[PDB]
Design a protein around this ligand. Structure first.
Ligand SMILES: CC[C@H](C)[C@H](N)C(=O)O
Ligand SMILES: CC[C@H](C)[C@H](N)C(=O)O
Ligand SMILES: [Zn+2]
Ligand SMILES: [Zn+2]
Lengths: 121, 115
């Protein structure tokens, strides 16, 4: 845990321009950023990118996005989100991170946070 | 389309308690509700359930939930969500925001149930 997403607020809905706030801590420094996007997660990634650029960190390209719930999980089901990344470019640098949470967007933020640390660590 | 979801606002994140607002039109009546949940969509359905309960409508149980983006993945990718219900059928939603894609499928399920 060298990079932590202290908090984030994600907005979306019908009649709403999606947006997200982020507050991440890295090396005794806290970065707060906001951005709109075509979707909540997209907005979250756009805000994240302004931070990583500042830090000189390159974010891998999102190659695959998978979401699943256990059978008969229902509305409050735990969501498993698997995101596949690629640093370049073709297969040799492809990897996946995963997140599990009752909110599907948080699950994605968690998988993204894991990715960030794997790249930094 | 018999039932229309005029608007809805969903809010989640780390450090926030998931909540959602919904505004729907049915049989010449406007219904507006709010509620928290374990997740945005969960909050949305909790708010929807208050409405359906008032209408005497029982919502089908959510059995499976599928989310996919087209090949050549990108953060701003369109989301295609397929939800499976059982009292067993399926509804679909397509939208750049994945929570909205689910809501669209939920709206479809609703209209299909209120026939
Ligand atoms: C990977 C696609 C993402 C999840 C979608 N565009 C959203 O912001 O909801
Ligand atoms: C079907 C499970 C839903 C998507 C999840 N509990 C959420 O509200 O994010
Ligand atoms: Zn907001
Ligand atoms: Zn709010």
């Amino acid at each position: 845990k060298v990079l932590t997403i202290k908090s984030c607020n994600i907005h979306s809905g019908i009649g709403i321009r999606p947006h997200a706030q982020i507050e991440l801590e890295y090396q005794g420094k806290i970065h707060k950023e906001i951005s709109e996007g075509d979707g909540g997660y997209d907005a979250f990634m756009n805000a994240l990118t302004k931070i990583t650029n500042r830090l000189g960190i390159s974010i891998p390209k999102l190659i695959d996005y998978e979401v699943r719930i256990p059978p008969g999980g229902k509305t409050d089901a735990l969501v498993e989100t698997r995101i596949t990344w690629n640093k370049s470019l073709e297969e040799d640098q492809t990897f996946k991170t995963m997140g599990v949470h009752p909110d599907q967007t948080v699950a994605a933020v968690h998988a993204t946070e894991k990715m960030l640390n794997q790249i930094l660590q």
